[PDB]
Amino acid sequence: RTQTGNNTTVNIIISTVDYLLRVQESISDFYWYYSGKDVIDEQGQRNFSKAIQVAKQVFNTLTEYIQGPCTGNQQSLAHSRLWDAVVGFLHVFAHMQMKLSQDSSQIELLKELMDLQKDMVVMLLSMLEGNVVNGTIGKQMVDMLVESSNNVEMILKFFDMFLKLKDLTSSDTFKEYDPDGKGVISKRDFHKAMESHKHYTQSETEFLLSCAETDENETLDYEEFVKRFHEPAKDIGFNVA
């Protein structure tokens, strides 16, 4: 951060924050390009994968800068452009979670992106490490959450739905909806399963059915469904909680 002896000092930490802002802007622009389009092609998949890996490495480097009670680096990052980058990343995360989950071909991209969100939340926790009651860093994060209120609500609703999925699957009503241990339940039986569970609204029900894979036999496998969604929701949403 500061080279004491040297005649000139370069703030590598602030430079890292600037590069993170640039890569966040690039990712946001690429999303805006792929927003109207229904499905992202393979080249877009590869480009998102590379950009997400680069951003993940940058977040890991920032987290290693902050870890420990490194007050100087904490204050330098608090008085920097990191908050705007995190806002843009939250925007991208929420909208990308909406768009990718519906399509089956985007599972690996969704996993990589949710890992990126996990690393971002890890960096934020490293920020809050050593924070006193009513601290400047925590107040700044609350201000950032206020700025990004809507997409945070989207992410929380996403995690809420894919967490209630496990309870619905474990519910006995689901057991007599699919009495056999075969593990496949029809679309109609599943829909009346939300209706009996009553913890899912109509919009939640329709969105989850859309995310569910549709077979010609129309019997989705709830085991693979929950394996796809609930456990990643558990892992990444624990950090947010």
Curated annotation (Swiss-Prot):
UniProt PTM comment: Channel activity is modulated by phosphorylation. Phosphorylation is increased in failing heart, leading to calcium leaks and increased cytoplasmic Ca(2+) levels.
Entry's induction text: By TGFB1.
Effect of residue 88 to A: Changed ryanodine-sensitive calcium-release channel activity characterized by increased sensitivity to cytosolic calcium activation
Localization in the cell: Sarcoplasmic reticulum membrane
Domain of life per record: Eukaryota
Reported tissue expression: Detected in heart muscle (at protein level). Heart muscle, brain (cerebellum and hippocampus) and placenta.
Disulfide bonds: none
Domain free text: The calcium release channel activity resides in the C-terminal region while the remaining part of the protein resides in the cytoplasm.
Family of the protein in this entry: Belongs to the ryanodine receptor (TC 1.A.3.1) family. RYR2 subfamily.
Subunit structure: Homotetramer. Can also form heterotetramers with RYR1 and RYR3. Interacts with FKBP1A and FKBP1B; these interactions may stabilize the channel in its closed state and prevent Ca(2+) leaks. Interacts with CALM and S100A1; these interactions regulate channel activity. Identified in a complex composed of RYR2, FKBP1B, PKA catalytic subunit, PRKAR2A, AKAP6, and the protein phosphatases PP2A and PP1. Interacts directly with FKBP1B, PKA, PP1 and PP2A. Interacts with SELENON. In cardiac muscles, identified in a complex, composed of FSD2, CMYA5 and RYR2.
Record's disease association: Ventricular tachycardia, catecholaminergic polymorphic, 1, with or without atrial dysfunction and/or dilated cardiomyopathy: An arrhythmogenic disorder characterized by stress-induced, bidirectional ventricular tachycardia that may degenerate into cardiac arrest and cause sudden death. Patients present with recurrent syncope, seizures, or sudden death after physical activity or emotional stress. CPVT1 inheritance is autosomal dominant. Ventricular arrhythmias due to cardiac ryanodine receptor calcium release deficiency syndrome: An autosomal dominant arrhythmogenic disorder characterized by syncope, cardiac arrest and/or sudden unexpected death, often in association with physical exertion or acute emotional stress. Patients who survive manifest polymorphic ventricular tachycardia and ventricular fibrillation. Unlike typical catecholaminergic ventricular tachycardia, arrhythmias are not reproducible on exercise stress testing or adrenaline challenge.
Task of the protein: Cytosolic calcium-activated calcium channel that mediates the release of Ca(2+) from the sarcoplasmic reticulum into the cytosol and thereby plays a key role in triggering cardiac muscle contraction. Aberrant channel activation can lead to cardiac arrhythmia. In cardiac myocytes, calcium release is triggered by increased Ca(2+) cytosolic levels due to activation of the L-type calcium channel CACNA1C. The calcium channel activity is modulated by formation of heterotetramers with RYR3. Required for cellular calcium ion homeostasis. Required for embryonic heart development.
The protein's name in its UniProt record: Ryanodine receptor 2
Native species: Homo sapiens (Human)
Gene that produces this protein: RYR2
Shown part of the complete sequence: 3859 to 4099 of 4967
